[PDB]
Write a protein that holds these residues in place. Structure first.
Motif, short mmCIF file in Angstrom:
data_model
loop_
_atom_site.label_atom_id
_atom_site.label_comp_id
_atom_site.label_asym_id
_atom_site.label_seq_id
_atom_site.Cartn_x
_atom_site.Cartn_y
_atom_site.Cartn_z
N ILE I 5 4.48 -23.90 -10.01
CA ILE I 5 4.13 -23.45 -11.19
C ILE I 5 5.03 -22.20 -11.77
N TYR I 7 8.40 -22.03 -12.63
CA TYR I 7 9.41 -23.00 -13.06
C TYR I 7 10.61 -22.45 -13.26
N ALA I 8 10.81 -20.99 -13.01
CA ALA I 8 11.93 -20.32 -12.72
C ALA I 8 12.64 -20.58 -11.40
N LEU I 11 13.68 -24.24 -10.96
CA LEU I 11 14.94 -24.45 -11.74
C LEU I 11 16.02 -23.70 -10.78
N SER I 12 15.90 -22.54 -10.53
CA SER I 12 17.03 -21.79 -9.86
C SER I 12 17.33 -22.26 -8.34
N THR I 15 19.07 -25.85 -8.95
CA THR I 15 20.55 -25.67 -9.42
C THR I 15 21.37 -24.82 -8.14
N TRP I 19 24.78 -26.46 -6.52
CA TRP I 19 26.08 -25.80 -6.52
C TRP I 19 26.60 -25.66 -5.06
N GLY I 22 27.86 -29.18 -3.91
CA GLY I 22 29.16 -29.59 -4.60
C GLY I 22 30.40 -28.95 -3.98
#
Ligand code: CLA
Ligand code: CLA
Ligand code: CLA
Ligand code: CLA
Ligand code: CLA
Ligand code: CLA
Ligand SMILES: CCCCCCCCCCCCCCCC(=O)OC[C@H](CO[C@@H]1O[C@H](CS(=O)(=O)O)[C@@H](O)[C@H](O)[C@H]1O)OC(=O)CCCCCCCCCCCCCCC
Ligand SMILES: CCCCCCCCCCCCCCCC(=O)OC[C@H](COP(=O)(O)OC[C@@H](O)CO)OC(=O)CCCCCCCCCCCCCCC
Ligand SMILES: CC1=C(/C=C/C(C)=C\C=C\C(C)=C/C=C/C=C(C)/C=C/C=C(C)/C=C/C2=C(C)C(=O)CCC2(C)C)C(C)(C)CCC1
Ligand SMILES: CC1=C(/C=C/C(C)=C/C=C/C(C)=C/C=C/C=C(C)/C=C/C=C(C)/C=C/C2=C(C)CCCC2(C)C)C(C)(C)CCC1
Ligand SMILES: CC1=C(C/C=C(\C)CCC[C@H](C)CCC[C@H](C)CCCC(C)C)C(=O)c2ccccc2C1=O
Ligand code: SF4
Ligand code: SF4
Ligand code: SF4
Ligand SMILES: [Ca+2]
Ligand SMILES: [Mg+2]
Lengths: 80, 31, 141, 731, 40, 75, 75, 143, 75
Positions: I5, I7-8, I11-12, I15, I19, I22
Motif C-alpha cells: 500500500i 507505493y513509495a 517503487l524505491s 529501483t 541499481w 546492475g
C-alpha cells in the motif's frame, strides 16, 4: 605510410627500437652522442603509428618523431 | 489572380538554363 | 626464402587466424626452434603447443609475428631468440624481414645506413609558411 | 584498388579502406592541400566557387518567391495581415493519413499546407509587392541572375579570363569598389526603389515598370534637389492615422526623419528608411574614395599600417598589409567575425525596431527570426576564431611580423589565456552561486531571501534614451537637458516609441535580466577562452612545442607525455562549439520566455520566476511544451504534429551524437573486425565482397560527426519547441 | 493529397522523381565514380 | 547539473586541459605561488572514470528525486 | 500483459544484450585482438595504444567496463 | 528626486507587507519571521514584494554590497596570503612536496595567525620586489 | 505488512535493488577482464572451456552483435 624522423638530440639509449612492436627502427653507428649510436627508421612501410617510441624517449622533447601519413592496410593495422 | 498553368510550366523551361550553366560550372571546377 | 621448413604448432584451430587477405594480398610467417614441446599463447587467441625442434607458423600481420617473437624471447625460462619473420605473397615470393641483418635492431650493428636522420633539432624545423604550396612538411625538408 | 577518387589527393585515393571516401568528402573544399595546388590556382578556383555560391543564393530566393506566388496566400494575406496565416508552400506527402491531411489543410487553403515563419510576406509587402505576378517575375528574374553568375564563374576559369594573383591582391581597388559601388551604389538604388515603389505603393499608388517613367515620386520633381531647398522632400509626412496601402492619412514626403513607429504597422517609417539608405549611400560612396588606384591620389594601406607604431607596442602594425593580404585565413577570420557581429546586430535591432508592416504582431516569425540570426552569428564567430587558429598554423610568418602587434599577442598568450580563465571562473562561480542561493531560499518557503540585484546600469542607459520608467531623468529622459533641447526631428517619435510599454523597444528589465546577462557574459567569455587559447597554442605549447609541424587538425599526439587527447586547435574549435550552443541556448531561452510574458501581458511570471532556475525549468520549459507534445495523441492529430515529431527527432539525433562523443575508436574497430570475420565466413553472403575495407571512423571524424549530430539535434529540438509553443499560444 | 494551385499534377510525379529516381540515379553514379580503379 | 557536468569530461581530452594548466601555472609563477607538486591534467583513464561517475550520479539522482516526489504525491 | 508490455520486454532484452555484448567483448579480447595482438602486456587498465592503426582508444577491458556502465544505466 | 521609481520601500509596498505577515520561521525562534519582516522592511521592494539590492555604489545602500564586499576581500586576501606564505616557506625545506601533502601544522598555524596584516605585507612585498616575478625568469612555451 | 500500500516504498525498493544488481554485474565484467589480464595462464588452459571460448570469441561476438542489432531494430 607514416613518417619517422630522428633528430640530433638522440642519446642512443635504444629505447626507440625496444618499444617498436613492428620493427620500424634500428640502432646504427653514429658519433653525436656518447653511445656512438643513433636510431633509424628504414622500414616505415610497416609503421602503424602507435607512438610507443616517443613514449619511450627521454630527451627533452623527443628525438624520434612519428607524423601519421597516408593510410595503408599495414599502417591501419589490418589483419584482413 | 492566381498563377497560371502555363506560368508554372514556363518556369521549369527557364530553369533549364541555370541547370545547364551549373553543370558546366561544376564540371569546370572539377578540373 | 628458399622454402620455409618447420612443423606447425600443435593447435586445434580458432576463428582468429588468417582471412581472405592472406591469399589475396599477403601473409606472414615466423619460424623458431624450441628445445622442448611446450605451451605458448597464440597472438590470435588461446594456447598452442610448439614442437621440439623447428616450428613454422603463419599469421595475418607482421605485428602478430613480432608479438609472438617477444613472447618467445621474454617469457620462456631458456629464451627462444632464433625466430625469423618473413613476408609471403600469393605468387609464392618469400621476403625475409626480421631480424633484418641477422642482428636484432635494438643493438648497433655495423653496415646499417641511417634512414630518416635529421642533422638538426626538432625546434630547428623551418616555419611552415616558408614551405607552403610545396609538397613538403617541416620534417620532410 | 588504383582508385581515382579523390583526384586531388593520392594519399587518400591510395587508402584501401572506407576512410578514403569519408576523407574525400571532408577535404574537398580545403583547396590549399590539394595535390599540386598553387596560390594563383587557389584564388581562381575560390573565385569560381564564389560565383557558384552566389548563384545558389539567388536560386534559393527564387524558390521562396516562386512557392509563395504559386502555392501561397500572398494576395489574401494582404487583405488582412493580422488574422490570416502566411503560407510557405504546399505539402505533398503520400505517407499522410486523413487526420494529418485535415490538420494541415489550414490558413484557409483547400490542400495540406505549411505556415511560413520566415517573415517573407511582411518583407515583400513592405517592399511594395502586392500580386503573385510580381513575385513570379522576381523569381524568374533571379533565375536569370543565377544563370548570369554561373556563366561568370565558368568564364573566369578559361585561360584568357583567369584573373592573376596580383589582381586578387589589389586590396586598395577592391576596397574602393566595395565601399563605393557594392555598398554605396546599392544603398542608393534601394533608396531609389523605396522612394519610387515602396513609399508610393504604401499610399495606394501603383508604381510598376509600366508607369514609373512617367509618375514622379514627388509632385515637385528633381529641380528642388538640383536647385537648393530639400525641405520640400520632407513635405507633409504620413499622418499618425495613415492606413497602410491606402490614401487615408497619406502624404507626399519621400525623405523624413520623424523616427519612432508607424502607428498601424508598428514598424519603422518607410520614408525614414529610404532617407537612411540615401544618407549611408552618400557616406559609403565617399568612403570608396580613400585608397589609391590608378590616379596618384588616395591612400596606401601598407603606409598607414607601417605608420602606426608605438612606444609601448614595439613595431605596431608594420607589415600587416602583407600579413593580411597573403593569408586567406586571416581575411576570412576578419570577415566571419565582423559578419557575426553584424548578424547579432540585425537580430537585436529587428526585434526591437522592426521595419516590415505588421511583423511586430507576428510573434512566431519574430521569435524564429531572432533565434535564426543569433544562431547564424554564433556559427560565424566560432568560424572566425577557427580560421584565426588556421592562420597561425599555416600562414603566420614570425620574422615579418617580428615585434609587431600579432607577435606581441603571441608573446603574452599565457597572460591572456590566464585572465580569460580568471574572469570565466569569476562569472561562473558567482552567477551559479546566486542562482542556487535563490533556488534553495525559494524552495524552503522564503522567496523574500533571494539576492535580487537591480540592473541599474542598463536601466540608466535606457533612461539616457528617454525611458522615464525608472525615474533617473538623465540626458534624453530629462527635458531640461541639452540633448533634448536640440530641435531634432526624431526626438518626439523616438520618445513616444520608447516610453510606451507596447513594443519591444528597450524592454523593461529586472533582476532576472541581470542574472541572465551575467550568464551570457560567462558564456561569451568561456567560448572566447576556448577559441583564443586554441588559436594561440595552435603553433605550440609545452605539451607540444612542435605542434605547427603537425597541422591544424590531427587525432592527437598519443598516450605519451601524460596523454594528449584533444590537443590540436581543431579540437579547441570542437570543444568551443558546445559552449557556443550553450550560450545560444541561454540567450534564446531568455528572449523567448521574456517575449512570451510580454506578448501575453504577464511580464510578472518572468520577473518573479526567472531569478531561480526551477522557474526556467517549470514555468518556461515544462509549461510551454504542453501543446507541443500534444501535436499527436492517442486521441488525434493537429497542426503541431510535425513539430512534436521533429522535437522527438532532435532529441534522438542529439542522443545519437553522444555515442560518437563518448565511445572512442578502438572499441569499434575491434567490433568491426568481428563483423568482417562473420561476413567472410557466411556462405551465400560469401559471394559478395566489399570494394573498400570496412574500418571504424577516425578519431577526428568521430569528434566531427558526434558534434554534427549534437548540433543538428540542438537546433531542431529548440526550433520545434519555439515554433510550436509560440504558435499554440499566439498563432 | 490534392492541389488547388495551378498545374497540381506536377507534385504527383515530381515527388517520386525527387525522392526516388534522382537519389537512386545520383547515388549509383557516385558509387560507380568513387570505385573506379583507373589511374588515380 | 551533475549530468551536464559529466559531459565536459566525456566529450574532451586531457591535452587541452594540460595546456590551459600551463597558462595558469604561468600565472602562478608570475606571483611566485606555484606549488612544488606540479598540477597535471587528469589522465585519460581518469577523465573517463570521472565522466562516467558523474553521469551515473547525476542521472540516478535525477530519477531518484523524480520517483520519490511522484510516489509520495500519489496517495 | 499486452502490446505495450511486449514492446517494452523486448526493449529490456535488447538493452541487456547490448550491455552483455560490451562486457563479454571486454573479457574475451583483454589479451589480444587482430588490432592489438599484445594487449595483455598493456594491462587491464590503460587508455589506448596510440592514434595509429587508425586509432586504438578504448580497447582495454577497463574501457569496456566504462562503456558497459552507460549501457547498464540505460537498461 | 524621483530616482528608482520602478521600486518602492518595502514598508510602503503592500504586497511585501502581506507576504511579510506570513514570513516563515527559519530557526527555532518563533520570532524569526517577524524579525525578518522588520529587517527587510528597510530595503527597496518590487511589485512582487521581494527586496531588491542596489549595488551601483551609493552609500545609502552600502550594506547591500560594499560592506560584504570589503569583508569577503579581507578574508580572501588573508587566506591566499597565508597560503602563499606557507608555500614559499616550504620551498627551503629540501622536500617541499611532502609538506605540501603532509602539512607542517606548527608552521602552517604560525603563518595563518599572522595573516591579519596581509595588505601591508603585500604592499611591502610589492615595493621590495618579493611579490611579483620578472617575465624573463618565468618558464614559457614556444610562440 | 503494509509495504504494498506504500507505493513509495514499493517503487524505491524495486529501483534500489535494481541499481545495486546492475552495478554488481558490471563489476563482474570488470573482474573477468582482470582475471584474463593478470591470472590467466595459457599453460594451464589447453583445450578447456576457457581456451575454446577464446578460440571462437569472433563467432560469439559477431553473433551477439547481430542479435543486438536485430533486437534494437525490432523493439
Ligand atoms: C563597384 C564594382 C564592384 C561591385 C559591384 C562588385 C561586387 C561584388 N564583388 Mg567585386 N571586385 C571589384 C569590383 C566590384 N565588385 C574589383 C574592381 C575587384 C578587383 C580589385 C574586385 C574583386 C573581387 C573578388 C576577388 C571577389 C569579389 C566579390 C564580389 C561580390 C561579393 C559577394 C556578395 O555578393 O555580397 C554582396 C554584398 C552586398 C550587396 C552588401 C554587403 C551586405 C551589407 C553590408 C549588410 C547587409 C545589407 C542589409 C542590411 C541586409 C539586407 C537584408 C535583405 C534580406 C533585406 C559582389 C557581388 C567576391 C565574389 O563573391 O565573387 C563573385 C569575390 O571573390 N570582388
Ligand atoms: C564562408 C565561410 C567559410 C569558408 C569559405 C570556410 C572554408 C574552409 N574551412 Mg571553415 N568554418 C566556417 C566557415 C568557413 N569555412 C565556420 C562557420 C566554421 C564553424 C562551424 C568553420 C570551422 C572550420 C573548421 C574547424 C575547419 C574548417 C575548415 C575549412 C577548409 C576546408 C573546408 C572543407 O573541406 O570542409 C568540408 C565540409 C563539410 C564536411 C561539410 C559538412 C557539414 C554539413 C554542411 C552539415 C550537414 C548537416 C546535416 C545534413 C543535417 C541535415 C538536417 C536534416 C537531417 C533534417 C576551407 C578552406 C577545415 C580545414 O581544412 O582546416 C584548415 C577545418 O578543419 N572550418
Ligand atoms: C553543467 C555543465 C558544465 C559545467 C558546470 C562546466 C564547468 C566549467 N567549464 Mg565546461 N564544458 C561542458 C560543460 C560544463 N562545464 C561541456 C559539455 C563541454 C564540451 C566538452 C565543456 C567544455 C569546456 C571547455 C573547453 C572549457 C570549459 C570551461 C569550464 C569552466 C568555466 C569557468 C567557470 O564557470 O567557473 C566556475 C565553475 C563552475 C560553475 C563549475 C563548478 C561548480 C561547483 C559546484 C563549484 C563548487 C565546488 C564543489 C563544492 C566541489 C566539491 C565537490 C564534492 C561535493 C565532491 C567551468 C569550471 C573553461 C575553463 O576551464 O575555464 C577556465 C574551458 O576551457 N568547459
Ligand atoms: C532552392 C530553391 C527551391 C526549393 C528549396 C524548392 C522546394 C520544393 N519544391 Mg520547388 N521550384 C523552384 C525552387 C525551389 N523549390 C523553382 C525556382 C521552380 C520553378 C522552376 C520550382 C518548381 C517546382 C515544381 C514544379 C514543384 C516544386 C516542388 C517543391 C517541393 C518538392 C521538391 C520537388 O519535388 O520539386 C522539384 C523542383 C524542381 C524540378 C525545380 C528546380 C528547383 C530549382 C530551380 C533548382 C534549385 C537547385 C538548388 C539551389 C541546388 C542546391 C544544392 C545544395 C544542396 C548544394 C519542395 C518543398 C513540388 C511541389 O509543388 O511541392 C508540393 C513541385 O511539383 N518546385
Ligand atoms: C565486492 C565487489 C568488488 C570488489 C571488492 C572490487 C575490488 C577491486 N576493484 Mg572493482 N568493481 C566493482 C566491485 C568490486 N570491486 C563494481 C560494482 C564495479 C562497477 C563500477 C567495479 C569496477 C571496477 C573497475 C573499473 C576497476 C575496479 C578495480 C578494483 C580494484 C581496486 C579498488 C579501487 O579502485 O580502489 C579505490 C576506490 C576508489 C578510488 C573509489 C572512489 C570513486 C567512487 C566510484 C566514488 C563513488 C561515489 C559515491 C558512491 C556516491 C557519491 C558520493 C559523493 C557525492 C561524495 C579492487 C581489487 C580497479 C582495478 O584496477 O582493478 C585491479 C579498476 O580499474 N573495479
Ligand atoms: C539514442 C542514441 C543512440 C543510438 C541511436 C545508438 C545506436 C546504437 N548503438 Mg549506441 N551509444 C549511445 C547512444 C546511442 N546509440 C551512447 C551515448 C553511448 C555512450 C556510452 C553508446 C555506446 C554504444 C556502445 C558501446 C554500443 C552501442 C551500440 C549501438 C547499436 C545497437 C544495435 C542496434 O540497436 O541496432 C539497430 C539500430 C537502431 C535501433 C537505431 C535506430 C534505427 C531507426 C529506428 C530505424 C532507421 C530508419 C532508417 C534507416 C532511416 C534512414 C533515412 C534515410 C534518409 C537514409 C545501435 C545502432 C552497440 C552495438 O553496436 O551493438 C552491435 C554497442 O556495442 N552504443
Ligand atoms: C543584366 C545584364 C548584365 C550584362 C549582360 C551580360 C550578358 C551577356 C553574356 C554573353 C555570354 C554569351 C555566351 C556564349 C559565348 C561564350 O560562351 O563565350 C565563352 C568565351 C570563352 O571562350 C573560352 O576560351 C577558352 C580559351 S581562351 O581563354 O579564350 O584562350 C577555351 O578553353 C574555352 O573552350 C572557350 O569557351 O568567352 C569569350 O571569349 C568572350 C565572352 C563574351 C561575354 C560577353 C559579356 C558582356 C559583358 C557584360 C557584363 C560585364 C560585367 C563585368 C563587370 C561586372
Ligand atoms: C568591458 C570591456 C573591456 C574589457 C576588455 C578586456 C579587458 C581589457 C584589458 C586589456 C588591457 C590592455 C593593455 C594594453 C597594453 C598596452 O598598454 O599597450 C601599449 C600601448 C601603447 O602603444 P600605442 O598605444 O602607441 O600602440 C597603438 C598602435 O598605434 C601601436 O601598435 O597602450 C595602449 O595601446 C593603450 C590601449 C590599450 C587597449 C586596451 C584593450 C581594450 C580596448 C577596448 C576597445 C577600445 C575602443 C575601440 C573602438 C574602436
Ligand atoms: C539611363 C540612366 C538613367 C535612367 C535610368 C532608368 C530609366 C531606369 C533605371 C533603373 C535602374 C538604374 C535600376 C533598377 C534596378 C532594379 C533592380 C536592381 C532590381 C533588383 C532586384 C534584386 C537585386 C532582387 C530583388 C528581389 C527580388 C527579385 C524579389 O522579387 C524579392 C526581393 C528581392 C530578393 C530583393 C538616369 C536618367 C536616371 C540617369 C542616367 C542613366
Ligand atoms: C584568432 C585570430 C584572429 C582573430 C579573430 C577574431 C574572431 C577576432 C575578433 C573579435 C571581436 C568579435 C571583436 C568585437 C568588437 C567590438 C567593438 C570593437 C565595438 C565597438 C564599440 C564602440 C566603441 C561603440 C560605441 C557606441 C555605443 C556603445 C553606443 C552609442 C554609439 C557609440 C558609437 C558611441 C585573427 C584572424 C584576426 C588573426 C589570427 C588570430
Ligand atoms: C575539466 C577536465 C580536466 C581538468 C580537471 C582537473 C584538473 C581536476 C580538478 C579537480 C580539483 C583540483 C579537485 C576538486 C574536486 C575534489 C576531488 C573534491 C573535494 C572536495 C572536498 C574538499 C570536500 C581534465 O584534466 C580532463 C582530462 C581528461 C578528460 C577530460 C578532462 C576535463 O574535462
Ligand atoms: S629515439 Fe630517443 S629514446 Fe629512442 S633510442 Fe633514440 S634517443 Fe633514445
Ligand atoms: S609509431 Fe609505433 S610502429 Fe611506428 S616506429 Fe614508433 S613504435 Fe614503431
Ligand atoms: S585520442 Fe585516443 S589514441 Fe589518442 S591519446 Fe587519446 S586515447 Fe589515445
Ligand atoms: Ca504595384
Ligand atoms: Mg528592421
Amino acid at each position: 605510410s607514416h613518417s619517422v624522423k630522428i633528430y640530433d638530440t638522440c642519446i642512443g639509449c635504444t629505447q626507440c627500437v625496444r618499444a617498436c612492436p613492428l620493427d620500424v627502427l634500428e640502432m646504427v653507428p653514429w658519433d653525436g652522442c656518447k653511445a656512438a649510436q643513433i636510431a633509424s627508421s628504414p622500414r616505415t612501410e610497416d609503421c602503424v603509428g602507435c607512438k610507443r617510441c616517443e613514449t619511450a624517449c627521454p630527451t627533452d622533447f623527443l628525438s624520434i618523431r612519428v607524423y601519421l601519413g597516408a593510410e595503408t592496410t599495414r599502417s591501419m593495422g589490418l589483419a584482413y | 489572380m492566381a498563377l497560371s498553368d502555363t506560368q508554372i510550366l514556363a518556369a521549369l523551361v527557364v530553369a533549364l538554363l541555370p541547370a545547364f550553366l551549373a553543370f558546366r560550372l561544376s564540371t569546370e571546377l572539377y578540373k | 626464402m628458399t622454402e620455409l621448413s618447420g612443423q606447425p604448432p600443435k593447435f586445434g584451430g580458432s576463428t582468429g587466424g588468417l582471412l581472405s587477405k592472406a591469399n589475396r594480398e599477403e601473409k606472414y610467417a615466423i619460424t623458431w626452434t624450441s628445445a622442448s614441446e611446450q605451451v605458448f599463447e597464440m597472438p590470435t587467441g588461446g594456447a598452442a603447443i610448439m614442437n621440439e625442434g623447428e616450428n613454422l607458423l603463419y599469421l595475418a600481420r607482421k605485428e602478430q609475428c613480432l608479438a609472438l617473437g617477444t613472447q618467445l624471447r621474454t617469457k620462456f625460462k631458456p629464451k627462444i631468440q632464433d625466430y625469423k619473420i618473413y613476408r609471403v605473397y600469393p605468387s609464392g615470393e618469400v621476403q625475409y624481414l626480421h631480424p633484418a641483418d641477422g642482428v636484432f635492431p635494438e643493438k648497433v650493428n655495423e653496415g646499417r645506413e641511417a634512414q630518416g636522420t635529421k642533422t638538426r633539432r626538432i625546434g630547428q624545423n623551418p616555419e611552415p609558411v616558408t614551405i607552403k604550396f610545396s609538397g613538403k612538411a617541416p620534417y620532410e625538408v | 584498388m588504383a582508385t581515382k577518387f579523390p583526384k586531388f589527393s593520392q594519399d587518400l585515393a591510395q587508402d584501401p579502406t572506407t576512410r578514403r571516401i569519408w576523407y574525400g568528402i571532408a577535404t574537398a573544399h580545403d583547396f590549399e592541400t590539394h595535390d599540386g595546388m598553387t596560390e594563383e590556382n587557389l584564388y581562381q578556383k575560390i573565385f569560381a566557387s564564389h560565383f557558384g555560391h552566389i548563384a545558389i543564393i539567388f536560386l534559393w530566393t527564387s524558390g521562396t518567391l516562386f512557392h509563395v506566388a504559386w502555392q501561397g496566400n500572398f494576395e489574401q494575406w494582404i487583405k488582412d495581415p493580422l488574422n490570416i496565416r502566411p503560407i510557405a508552400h504546399a505539402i505533398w506527402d503520400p505517407h499522410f493519413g486523413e487526420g494529418a491531411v485535415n490538420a494541415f489543410t489550414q490558413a484557409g487553403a483547400s490542400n495540406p499546407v505549411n505556415i511560413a515563419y520566415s517573415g517573407v510576406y511582411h518583407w515583400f509587402y513592405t517592399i511594395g509587392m502586392t500580386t503573385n505576378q510580381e513575385l513570379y517575375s522576381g523569381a524568374v528574374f533571379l533565375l536569370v541572375l543565377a544563370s548570369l553568375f554561373l556563366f561568370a564563374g565558368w568564364l573566369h576559369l578559361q585561360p584568357k579570363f583567369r584573373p592573376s594573383l596580383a589582381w586578387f591582391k589589389n586590396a586598395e581597388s577592391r576596397l574602393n569598389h566595395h565601399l563605393a559601388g557594392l555598398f554605396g551604389v546599392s544603398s542608393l538604388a534601394w533608396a531609389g526603389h523605396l522612394v519610387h515603389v515602396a513609399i508610393p505603393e504604401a499610399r495606394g499608388q501603383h508604381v510598376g515598370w509600366d508607369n514609373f517613367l512617367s509618375t514622379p515620386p514627388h509632385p515637385a520633381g528633381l529641380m528642388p534637389f538640383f536647385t537648393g531647398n530639400w525641405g520640400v522632400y520632407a513635405a507633409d509626412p504620413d499622418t499618425a492615422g495613415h492606413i497602410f496601402g491606402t490614401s487615408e492619412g497619406a502624404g507626399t514626403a519621400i525623405l523624413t526623419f520623424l523616427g519612432g513607429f508607424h502607428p498601424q504597422t508598428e514598424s519603422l517609417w518607410l520614408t525614414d528608411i529610404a532617407h537612411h539608405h540615401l544618407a549611408i549611400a552618400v557616406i559609403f560612396i565617399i568612403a570608396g574614395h580613400m585608397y589609391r588606384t590608378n590616379w596618384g591620389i588616395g591612400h596606401s594601406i601598407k603606409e598607414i599600417l607601417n605608420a602606426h607604431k608605438g612606444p609601448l607596442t614595439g613595431a605596431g602594425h608594420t607589415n600587416l598589409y602583407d600579413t593580411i593580404n597573403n593569408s586567406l585565413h586571416f581575411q576570412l577570420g576578419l570577415a566571419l567575425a565582423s559578419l557575426g557581429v553584424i548578424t547579432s546586430l540585425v537580430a537585436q535591432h529587428m526585434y526591437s525596431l522592426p521595419s516590415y508592416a505588421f511583423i511586430a504582431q507576428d510573434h512566431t516569425t519574430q521569435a524564429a527570426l531572432y533565434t535564426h540570426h543569433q544562431y547564424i552569428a554564433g556559427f560565424l564567430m566560432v568560424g572566425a576564431f577557427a580560421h584565426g587558429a588556421i592562420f597561425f598554423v599555416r600562414d603566420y610568418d614570425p620574422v615579418a611580423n617580428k615585434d609587431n602587434v600579432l607577435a606581441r599577442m603571441l608573446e603574452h598568450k599565457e597572460a591572456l589565456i590566464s585572465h580569460l580563465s580568471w574572469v570565466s571562473l569569476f562569472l561562473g562561480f558567482h552567477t551559479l552561486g546566486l542562482y542556487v542561493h535563490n533556488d534553495v531560499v525559494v524552495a524552503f518557503g522564503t522567496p523574500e531571501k533571494q539576492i535580487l540585484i537591480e540592473p541599474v546600469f542598463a536601466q540608466w542607459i535606457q533612461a539616457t534614451s528617454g525611458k522615464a520608467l525608472y525615474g533617473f531623468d538623465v540626458l534624453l529622459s530629462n527635458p531640461d537637458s541639452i540633448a533634448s533641447t536640440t530641435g531634432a526631428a526624431w526626438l518626439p517619435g523616438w520618445l513616444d516609441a520608447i516610453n510606451s510599454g507596447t513594443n519591444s523597444l528597450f524592454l523593461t528589465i529586472g533582476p532576472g535580466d541581470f542574472l541572465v546577462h551575467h550568464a551570457i557574459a560567462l558564456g561569451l567569455h568561456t567560448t572566447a577562452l576556448i577559441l583564443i587559447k586554441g588559436a594561440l597554442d595552435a603553433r605550440g605549447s609545452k605539451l607540444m612545442p612542435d605542434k605547427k609541424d603537425f597541422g591544424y587538425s590531427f587525432p592527437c599526439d598519443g598516450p605519451g607525455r601524460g596523454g594528449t587527447c584533444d590537443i590540436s586547435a581543431w579540437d579547441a574549435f570542437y570543444l568551443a562549439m558546445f559552449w557556443m550552443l550553450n550560450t545560444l541556448g541561454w540567450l534564446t531561452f531568455y528572449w523567448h520566455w521574456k517575449h512570451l510574458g510580454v506578448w501575453s501581458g504577464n511580464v510578472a511570471q518572468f520577473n518573479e520566476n526567472s531569478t531561480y532556475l526551477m522557474g526556467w525549468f517549470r514555468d518556461y520549459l515544462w509549461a510551454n511544451s504542453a501543446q507541443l507534445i500534444n501535436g499527436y495523441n492517442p486521441y488525434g492529430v493537429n497542426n503541431l504534429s510535425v513539430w512534436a515529431w521533429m522535437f522527438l527527432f532532435g532529441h534522438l539525433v542529439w542522443a545519437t551524437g553522444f555515442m560518437f562523443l563518448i565511445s572512442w575508436r578502438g572499441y569499434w574497430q575491434e567490433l568491426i573486425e568481428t563483423i568482417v570475420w562473420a561476413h567472410e565466413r557466411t556462405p551465400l553472403a560469401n559471394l559478395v565482397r566489399w570494394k573498400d575495407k570496412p574500418v571504424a571512423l577516425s578519431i577526428v571524424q568521430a569528434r566531427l560527426v558526434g558534434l554534427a549530430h549534437f548540433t543538428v539535434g540542438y537546433v531542431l529540438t529548440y526550433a520545434a519547441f519555439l515554433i510550436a509553443s509560440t504558435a499554440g499560444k499566439f498563432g | 493529397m490534392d492541389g488547388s494551385y495551378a498545374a497540381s499534377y506536377l507534385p504527383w510525379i515530381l515527388i517520386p522523381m525527387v525522392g526516388w529516381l534522382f537519389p537512386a540515379v545520383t547515388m549509383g553514379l557516385l558509387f560507380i565514380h568513387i570505385e573506379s580503379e583507373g589511374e588515380g | 547539473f551533475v549530468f551536464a557536468f559529466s559531459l565536459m569530461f566525456l566529450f574532451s581530452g586531457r591535452g587541452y586541459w594540460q595546456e590551459l594548466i600551463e597558462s595558469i601555472v604561468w600565472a602562478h609563477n608570475k606571483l611566485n605561488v606555484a606549488p612544488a607538486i606540479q598540477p597535471r591534467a587528469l589522465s585519460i583513464i581518469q577523465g573517463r572514470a570521472v565522466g562516467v561517475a558523474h553521469y551515473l550520479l547525476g542521472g540516478i539522482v535525477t530519477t531518484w528525486a523524480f520517483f520519490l516526489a511522484r510516489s509520495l504525491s500519489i496517495g | 500483459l499486452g502490446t505495450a508490455d511486449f514492446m517494452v520486454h523486448h526493449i529490456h532484452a535488447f538493452t541487456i544484450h547490448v550491455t552483455a555484448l560490451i562486457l563479454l567483448k571486454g573479457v574475451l579480447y583483454a589479451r589480444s585482438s587482430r588490432l592489438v595482438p599484445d594487449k595483455a602486456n598493456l594491462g587491464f587498465r590503460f587508455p589506448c595504444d596510440g592514434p595509429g592503426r587508425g586509432g586504438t582508444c578504448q580497447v582495454s577491458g577497463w574501457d569496456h567496463v566504462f562503456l558497459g556502465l552507460f549501457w547498464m544505466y540505460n537498461s | 528626486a524621483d530616482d528608482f521609481a520602478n521600486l518602492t520601500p518595502c514598508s510602503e509596498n503592500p504586497a511585501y507587507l502581506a507576504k511579510s505577515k506570513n514570513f516563515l520561521n527559519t530557526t527555532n525562534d518563533p520570532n524569526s519571521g517577524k524579525i525578518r519582516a522588520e529587517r527587510y522592511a528597510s530595503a527597496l521592494c518590487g511589485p512582487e514584494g521581494y527586496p531588491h539590492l542596489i549595488v551601483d555604489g551609493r552609500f545609502t545602500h552600502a550594506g547591500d554590497f560594499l560592506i560584504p564586499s570589503i569583508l569577503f576581500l579581507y578574508i580572501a586576501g588573508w587566506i591566499g596570503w597565508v597560503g602563499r606564505s606557507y608555500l614559499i616557506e616550504i620551498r627551503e625545506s629540501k622536500n617541499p612536496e611532502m609538506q605540501e601533502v603532509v602539512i607542517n601544522v606548527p608552521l602552517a598555524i604560525k603563518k595563518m595567525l599572522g595573516g591579519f596584516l596581509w595588505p601591508l605585507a603585500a604592499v611591502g612585498e610589492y615595493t621590495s620586489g618579493k611579490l611579483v616575478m620578472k617575465d624573463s625568469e618565468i618558464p614559457t612555451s614556444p610562440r | 505488512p503494509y509495504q504494498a500500500i506504500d507505493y513509495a516504498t514499493q517503487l524505491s525498493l524495486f529501483t534500489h535493488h535494481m541499481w545495486i544488481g546492475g552495478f554488481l554485474i558490471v563489476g563482474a565484467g570488470a573482474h573477468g577482464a582482470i582475471f584474463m589480464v593478470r591470472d590467466y595462464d595459457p599453460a594451464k588452459n589447453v583445450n578447456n572451456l576457457l581456451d575454446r571460448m577464446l578460440r571462437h570469441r569472433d563467432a560469439i561476438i559477431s553473433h551477439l552483435n547481430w542479435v543486438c542489432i536485430f533486437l534494437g531494430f525490432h523493439s
